[PDB]
Nucleic acid binder design. Structure first.
Ligand SMILES: Nc1ncnc2c1ncn2[C@@H]1O[C@H](COP(=O)(O)OP(=O)(O)OP(=O)(O)O)[C@@H](O)[C@H]1O
Ligand SMILES: [Mg+2]
Lengths: 437, 437
RNA sequence: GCGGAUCCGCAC
RNA sequence: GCGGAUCCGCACC
RNA sequence: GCGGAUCCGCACC
RNA sequence: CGCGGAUCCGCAC
């Protein structure tokens, strides 16, 4: 009962406390003071500026507004100077407009140069767009900032908050547009129960329609899909979650889950009872950001899954896990072992030249005719999915992601049986197999 | 060695001696005296009437001519009454067209009733062309009767003589048409090396052309394919044999092959080396004619084969064996065991009604979303191909042929391992698996 | 009987 | 996956 | 200025 | 293969 009581308690988990707020205001005031000493033009943007930031995620964003006549090189050099001059400690990121990330009075700060611009139609960067996003949202989001926080909390608790490749979920900007459109958490959730994979939500035009894909129209740029990196399966998960929530609302939807964590002996028994082949490809993690690594782990998994398909090991699902030192690609197959013998297709009976060649190979068994065509019994190179993947991975490393493939080329290990359960992959195995807690 | 030395030596084991000719001659006159006494129209046809029957395969075809104003009932009654009166001892065993099969002074005789007809179109019985085949062949075949016998011997020795369902090979009539068309064995064999699955041989127009299938046009009826029941694989086998024969001619081509005959222990070790599941379905032979039986064993084998494919046991080949008392359906599969768990497909995420129903079923493991669609891990009833077929044959007996299925319903047994290698099916197993000498 | 085509039913 | 029907084709010569 | 990856499109009948 | 686009990123040469 009392969805309202639940949302009241959910806000406690999600609204920054008075101390975190004070710390942000003090950093902001100081930052303004330092910027104003330099005579510079600037805007505070983002979640801090709109008071929509989540408990524990305090960060200030300052965009430095330069004349459009300035060159990109001038933008970088001027901006980097001002950033470095205005922060307690600092560090430089990005290329194009490189920006300065640092601290002011314990608070994380981003100082970003961009062109000022009168109109949204003069955008030659994503960061040129950010001030327009803010300008569109400030004043439309006032009074609803806690609705935004509820939505962000709901998504974060369920592992689908963030558009970055590791998550492929809902961006903070997206969450704010949805609150502007529907007017609250709860109305978003009620309506989302009827979203489809062809739903188009058009903020600026004040409408919903049907399209080719799930598409949230950026009110600052009609050709841009704010939900571009929201995966189909995460869209599906959110819609399912919204239907569950309205059927039986609970504070549990806003609390992050903590893994099953079961004995390796119970896990051994589960795998035994399923009768499947369960194994991992272990290799050293490439030294690359998550946004490069995760799509490559997705590719590697997919390629090996497809190899297992072709070689008739009948894979069920794949999964992956990246630790700080190693990466793991996990597979479960319905076939533990396949026959040594297989059938190799030959030519039609009427192709004399190639029939003679086909029949000339020395084989343990006699070729045979079936349905007008010659076939031969030949011997497989590998007989288990573990052995098959060892071969594919050593041979086709190059197709398994640029950096992941190069890592596998240097070293990989195939792990199965009881040795796999001692690896730090138990939560992924459980989820992949649908183990009830 | 050398074709013409071989063919002269081949004629010895193919041309019947006087001893056998006299018994046929004596039998035909004794038969002729009995038919003349009754005063019924009769015609001698087939290989005996044209002196093209194979050594040690003497049989005499006599055709009773009836008017078209009789009907199929009277045709049957009066035709069988005559054959029984005319023969020493008789059997009445046929699939459709009535005829008496018996003996006259130690010689096989078939007494077949048919209609007279002005011309061999719009036929009434099914054997009504045979008197027209005889008229077409007597005269054209004179001087070529030993060439026919060579061809029949070549085919019989290689298990592909006869158009009956047990063989699905070349008929005697087809052999005679080919020798008339090409002029000889050797020329048939030479030209057969370039037959394809779209080769049309039109004897009446004296030409070969391309069609939709392998078609030997009946000079008596241009709509009739004399090779209708020659299977694609036996055509291929023939074409292959002619190529081999012309590259290295041998008298072995005209001699029957002895069975492979090997010890159950070698047979066991071969199966272990192949890594396959080998098993048989044993049931009692229905009391029916071969021309109904063999097609039904083919269907039953095909249905079970297709079951094994669907259930992901990856069958390699099948075969069958009919003995006096029992029939056997043989299978070799690449998968000896499959996991208990499999994937059941559920609805798309949008389809709330069906998602709810799908998600409400009790299961050991949690359902999951994949590519916009719900899936569940469920549990197989069986986990080996033998267990699968036990289920399928107990439950789908009715679809395994009319008589064959009805027998399988009253009793069947699945046999594998050591106990299979004692069943009288070693020859068929060896042929299935391509076992060498 | 078996197969092909065409239709009808049931189970998806 | 199965269960009927009809027409045609094929085997039994 | 550039740089990185992943997915898609395009060209090669 | 490469080129181009989209997406999520980074300091790049
Ligand atoms: N499947 C068939 N196709 C065409 N004609 C057939 C067929 N079966 C029988 N006949 C006709 O009936 C005749 C006798 O049939 P039969 O089965 O006795 O073969 P055959 O020609 O006598 O050769 P043999 O008896 O030596 O095997 C044939 O010559 C033929 O004209
Ligand atoms: Mg005969």
């Amino acid at each position: 009962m009392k969805v309202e009581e639940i949302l009241e308690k959910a806000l406690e988990l999600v609204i920054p406390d008075e101390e975190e707020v004070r710390k942000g205001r003090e950093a902001e005031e100081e930052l303004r003071r330092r910027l104003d000493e330099l005579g510079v033009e600037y805007v505070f943007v983002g979640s801090y500026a709109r008071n929509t930031w989540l408990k524990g995620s305090l960060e200030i964003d300052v965009f430095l507004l330069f004349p459009e006549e300035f060159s990109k090189e001038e933008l970088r050099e001027r901006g980097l100077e001002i950033g470095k001059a205005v922060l307690d400690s600092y560090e430089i990121r990005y290329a194009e407009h490189p920006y300065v990330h640092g601290v002011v009075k314990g608070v994380e700060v981003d100082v970003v140069p961009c062109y000022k611009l009168k109109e949204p139609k003069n955008i030659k960067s994503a960061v040129d767009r950010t001030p327009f996003h803010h300008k569109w949202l400030e004043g439309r989001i006032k009074g609803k900032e806690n609705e935004v926080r509820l939505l962000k909390g709901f998504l974060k608790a369920n592992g689908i908050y963030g558009a970055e490749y590791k998550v492929r979920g809902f961006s903070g900007y997206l969450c704010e547009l949805l609150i502007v459109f529907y007017g609250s958490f709860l109305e978003t959730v009620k309506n989302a129960r009827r979203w489809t994979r062809r739903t188009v939500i058009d903020v600026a035009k004040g409408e919903v329609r049907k399209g080719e894909e799930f598409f949230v129209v950026d009110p600052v740029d009609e050709k841009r899909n704010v939900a571009a990196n929201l995966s189909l399966d995460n869209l599906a998960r959110f819609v399912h979650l919204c239907r569950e929530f309205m059927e039986a609302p609970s504070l549990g939807f806003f609390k992050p889950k903590h893994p099953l964590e079961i004995e390796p002996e119970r896990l051994r028994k589960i795998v035994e009872e399923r009768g499947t082949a369960v194994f991992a490809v272990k290799f050293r993690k490439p030294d690359i950001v998550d946004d490069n690594l995760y799509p490559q782990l997705e590719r590697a998994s997919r390629k090996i899954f497809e190899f297992l398909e072709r070689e008739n090991f009948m894979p069920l699902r794949s999964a992956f896990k990246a630790s700080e030192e190693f990466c793991y690609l996990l597979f479960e197959c319905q076939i533990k072992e396949i026959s040594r013998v297989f059938r190799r297709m030959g030519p039609q009976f009427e192709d004399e030249r190639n029939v003679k060649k086909f029949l000339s190979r020395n084989r343990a068994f006699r070729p045979f005719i079936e349905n007008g065509r010659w076939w031969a019994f030949e011997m497989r190179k590998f007989t288990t999915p573990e052995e098959g993947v060892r071969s594919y991975a050593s041979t086709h490393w190059h197709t398994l992601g640029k950096n992941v493939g190069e890592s596998i080329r240097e070293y990989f290990e195939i792990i199965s049986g009881e040795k796999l359960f001692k690896e730090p992959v138990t939560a992924e195995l459980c989820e992949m197999m649908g183990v009830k807690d």
